[model samples]
Target: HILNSSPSDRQINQLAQRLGPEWEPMVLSLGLSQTDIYRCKANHPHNVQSQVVEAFIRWRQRFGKQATFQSLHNGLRAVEVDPSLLLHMLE
Candidate 1:
């Protein structure tokens, strides 16, 4: 159910396209849920998804100075993604 609804790398790349390369900092910094990301940006004006993206950039600039993409990927997906692949981690 989850992966079916989940965004593909192509889709994420597209959404990231709308945000800009500064978003790379966010992608590089913290792991965020796709739904929470959409929710975080939803309250803004149509153009303010940029700000959501910016908030992520700021979050990383301030907190992710020592982070890595792999670590961040694990961190965010660990929280927001479905649990099948992660079943082993539950123990």
Candidate 2:
């Protein structure tokens, strides 16, 4: 249901006014804690899905599934993507 709804600016205002004190709980139920509920609305899964899938395939082809996350990090560090950015990818 959350995936299907992308509230417009006017719709958000209406919802907030209608829900009143319930607005915060409703937001939390949808896994958000702020009014920026549309943050992920613009991000279609297909946008990054293929990239991640292709990256996984390439990683497997290059290092095999048996490769440890640390080994992958080492290889990434060699290319200088920076450990901080790579750490986010780790998760």
Candidate 3:
């Protein structure tokens, strides 16, 4: 049996959009100098999920391979979301 393994950035981002989790402030939580969520959100004014999609993109853009799944957990936690919640549905 395998324990928790890291998820790919693509899949991680795919799940990020699947949830209605608060991602605005959480976006900034990931060592970024202000993301373009404002502009990207304009692309889908109806779906805020697009904003999260852009958020992860922005974080990865700046952090490169330095980004990790745990970073997402921390970033979400920065917005006060409990950690296990993501991992539970993450798979």
Candidate 4:
């Protein structure tokens, strides 16, 4: 059966509860600049978050604030993990 009925937080908690009673629930919430998201989302035209992060890292390394357009494009080419798709039948 699928546990898709519950919200993500509930799913996380349920899984933690099943694994062990001692599993303390922890949530990592980051409040990054919404402005950054908009700018990157516009300029860094990768359909995935990995593409954006990968591009940002490479961009930082090259110009330290002066990366060329090619670097951004390269980051977009990087592959991301589609884990659920890979293991859908296993569950």
- Please give the CA lDDT of all the candidate structures: 0.44, 0.36, 0.65, 0.31
TM-score of 2: 0.32
lDDT of 2: 0.36
Q: Model 1 misses residue 15 by how many Å?
A: 6.9
The candidate that wins on lDDT is 3
Model 3 spans with C-alpha error above 4 angstroms:
1-10, 33-35
Which is the better candidate, 2 or 4, if ranked by TM-score? 2
Q: Write the per-residue lDDT of candidate 2 for residues 1-91, one digit (tens) a residue.
A: 3223333334333333333233333333333334333332233355433322333333334444343344434443454434354334323
Please give the distance, in angstroms, between residue 8's alpha carbon in candidate 3 and its true position after superposition: 3.8
Each model's TM-score?
0.34, 0.32, 0.70, 0.23
Better of 3 and 4 by TM-score: 3
Instruction: Provide the lowest-lDDT 10-residue window in model 4.
Output: 21-30
Off by over 4 Å in 2: 1-49, 89-91
lDDT of 3: 0.65
> Which regions in candidate 1 have their CA more than 4 angstroms from the true location?
1-44, 82-91
lDDT of 1: 0.44
How do the candidates rank by TM-score, highest first? 3, 1, 2, 4
TM-score top scorer: 3
lDDT of 4 by residue, 8-64 (tens): 333333332332211111110112244544554576476534334433443344344
**Per-residue lDDT of candidate 3, residues 5-55 (tens digit):** 344566656757555556667766776545376676777788666666766
Candidate 4's displacement at residue 9, Å, is: 28
Q: What alpha-carbon RMSD in Å does predicted model 1 have with respect to the real structure?
A: 11.5
